[PDB]
Design a protein around this ligand. Structure first.
Ligand SMILES: [Cl-]
Length: 226
């Protein structure tokens, strides 16, 4: 079943955003060496060993969990900034191993675009604030417009940006028509693709908030990884 090729490209994207030099090695090999998947309780931000459905980090299906009322919540329209309708109570994150230390954490985020649900990985430094990279691993927006979330030049703009402001509130901004420079939080919007851009904005506003990875990244900031 492939199914397998889907799992493998996901692993590829994780390795890609992790900034690991692939010394010719294959993806399943690099993933075992450098990646440690962990489950996270969103509300508390704590690492957990199992989800409510009994899954471990190795077999947890967060998308399926999000539609199971036993282990997810229904978001009000106002709460639902990323326009995803529901949120699993437990998330998965991918720790990047240096040696015995954790070098980065990669968090899965998503939000609705114009034509499609848009899924991305965001690589965060162990300060729990600085973005190391971003990659969209599933989206179906129009090439040349919203599809430009896959453009290397647009994604590179996220590198060095801070996720949070001084109150640890979500601070990433999709700035219509080009952010300034020396900008702490701002990246350029997608020209001609405001609706996709709004979906990206909502993605960060929700997933950096109290119902998302907010509590977790706070614990990262306070040294919860190493
Ligand atoms: Cl979710």
């Amino acid at each position: 079943q492939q199914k397998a090729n889907a799992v493998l490209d996901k692993q590829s994207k994780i390795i890609e955003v992790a900034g690991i030099d692939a010394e010719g090695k294959k993806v399943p090999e690099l993933f075992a060496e450098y990646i440690e998947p962990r489950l996270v309780d969103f509300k508390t931000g704590d690492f957990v060993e199992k989800a409510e459905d009994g899954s471990t980090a190795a077999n947890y299906d967060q998308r399926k969990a999000a539609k199971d009322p036993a282990e997810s919540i229904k978001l009000t329209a106002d709460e639902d900034k990323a326009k995803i309708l529901r949120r699993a109570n437990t998330g998965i994150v991918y720790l990047v191993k240096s040696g015995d230390d954790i070098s980065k954490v990669i968090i899965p985020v998503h939000g609705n675009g114009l034509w499609s649900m848009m899924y991305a990985f965001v690589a965060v430094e162990t300060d729990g604030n600085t973005v190391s990279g971003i990659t969209y691993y599933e989206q179906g927006e129009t090439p040349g417009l919203g599809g430009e979330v896959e453009n290397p030049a647009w994604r590179a703009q996220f590198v060095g940006k801070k996720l949070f402001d001084e109150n640890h509130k979500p601070a990433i901004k999709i700035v219509k028509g080009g952010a300034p420079e020396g900008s702490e939080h701002g990246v350029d919007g997608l020209s001609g693709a405001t609706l996709t851009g709004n979906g990206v904005q909502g993605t960060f506003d929700f997933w950096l908030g109290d119902m998302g990875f907010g509590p977790f990244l706070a614990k990262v900031r306070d040294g919860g990884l190493n």
